[PDB]
């Protein structure tokens, strides 16, 4: 089930057995990852770089056309974002809730969810410090989190 | 969450044998499960089975006979010396003629009677009869 919810959902993507590349796909590895390069400079997280590639350009899985995965391609080039995207989107959401909660103090549900969201930040933050992608002294401050979007 | 795949596999086989079915589908697969049923195979308690290979933890379909009374797992995997083995089989086997305790040793996963035959202790996994 969900980490901070009682729902038990089963909807998920189902990857096919055949991990080859289809014959009708003519893009080779080199010009796919320059297609990935220019999409990073437009400004896009790796989550939707792979989305706008499998519905307009036909590449089912970048890891099957190339040998690498999208976020691994980017940092191997130098275009990776400074903090991980999934930690980035939690901080962005907790800032919005914290701002909305600030303007009306009677929103108890907003206060309850803010506890939940900032709990998931700390759970994820200490994971990235064990795998050493954040500095060991990196901390989440509620006041300064607004500056970094 | 799922914690011991072997505990789920044997509980699934025991329910379907208890209700009289002919085949069981074991959802997660591992070397421990495949090696455990081959021990049950050699003694005629189950028929021959088949593991389905998706590129994840595979599935297994196991042919059943009517000979299995109960298969089980012991949690946690205690360590057992040759001195303790007679006491363990005194507790969790029906009689002294049939029934087996499967326990992993450095020589491999293998049941109790012959684990004594090559003089090796090990860690208890489960029992069947």
């Amino acid at each position: 089930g969900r980490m901070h919810a009682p729902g038990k959902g089963l909807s998920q993507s189902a990857l096919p057995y055949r991990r080859s590349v289809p014959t009708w796909l003519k893009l080779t590895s080199d010009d796919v990852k320059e297609q990935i390069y220019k999409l990073a400079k437009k400004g896009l997280t790796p989550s939707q770089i792979g989305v706008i590639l499998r519905d307009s350009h036909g590449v089912a899985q970048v890891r099957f056309v190339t040998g690498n995965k999208i976020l691994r391609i980017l940092k191997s080039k130098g275009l990776a974002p400074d903090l991980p995207e999934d930690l980035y989107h939690l901080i962005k959401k907790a800032v919005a809730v914290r701002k909305h909660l600030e303007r009306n103090r009677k929103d108890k549900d907003a206060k309850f969810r803010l506890i939940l969201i900032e709990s998931r930040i700390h759970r994820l933050a200490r994971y990235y410090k064990t795998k050493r992608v954040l500095p060991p002294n990196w901390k989440y401050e509620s006041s300064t989190a607004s500056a970094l979007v | 969450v799922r914690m011991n795949v072997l505990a789920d596999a044997l509980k699934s086989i025991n329910n379907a044998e208890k209700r009289g079915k002919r085949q069981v589908l074991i959802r997660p697969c591992s070397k421990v499960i495949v090696r455990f049923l081959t021990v049950m195979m050699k003694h005629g308690y189950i028929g021959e089975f088949e593991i389905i290979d998706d590129h994840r933890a595979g599935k297994i379909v196991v042919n059943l006979t009517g000979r299995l009374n109960k298969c089980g797992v012991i949690s946690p995997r205690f360590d057992v010396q040759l001195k303790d083995l007679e006491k363990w089989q005194n507790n969790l086997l029906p009689s002294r003629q049939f029934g087996f305790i499967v326990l992993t040793t450095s020589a491999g996963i293998m049941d109790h009677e012959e684990a004594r035959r090559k003089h090796t202790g090990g860690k208890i996994l489960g029992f069947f009869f």
Binding site: - | S75, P76, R77, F78
Partner: protein, 141 residues
């Protein structure tokens, strides 16, 4: 058992200690409150001086006067009520003499129809009370 890990011996052991204190018989033997409430102090017998001879009513279904004696212990000075057991044996006990008292059977619990006595007389004036009943010995005068 509920928790079944290999490294949970401290959890299991420290849970026995807490839950053994809710056992009534464990609670009284391993606390000093029960021992200090015992008039005997933890002994099987005790000697005391007779203060007075008293008789109590028995209880609702029964109807008889239970011949008892109020005795004051020597080691403590505590005053308890003992029950002269047998039939007519109360004559052999007079005021101001030394008797040997023992428990009445149920480890400090009241027994039978006599309300609230824990003790019984076995010897008066250093001569066995059963011997006086049988006539084998007489009061030392």
């Amino acid at each position: 058992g509920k928790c079944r890990g290999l490294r949970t011996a401290r959890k299991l052991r420290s849970h026995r200690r807490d839950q053994k204190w809710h056992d009534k018989q464990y609670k009284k033997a391993h606390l000093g409150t029960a021992l200090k409430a015992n008039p005997f102090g933890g002994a099987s017998h005790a000697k005391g001086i007779v203060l007075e001879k008293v008789g109590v009513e028995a209880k609702q279904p029964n109807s008889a006067i239970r011949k008892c004696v109020r005795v004051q212990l020597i080691k403590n000075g505590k005053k308890i009520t003992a029950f002269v057991p047998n039939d007519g044996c109360l004559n052999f006990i007079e005021e101001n003499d030394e008797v040997l008292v023992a428990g009445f059977g149920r480890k400090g619990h009241a027994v039978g129809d006599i309300p609230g006595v824990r003790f019984k007389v076995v010897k008066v004036a250093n001569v066995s009370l059963l011997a006086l009943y049988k006539g084998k010995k007489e009061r030392p005068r």
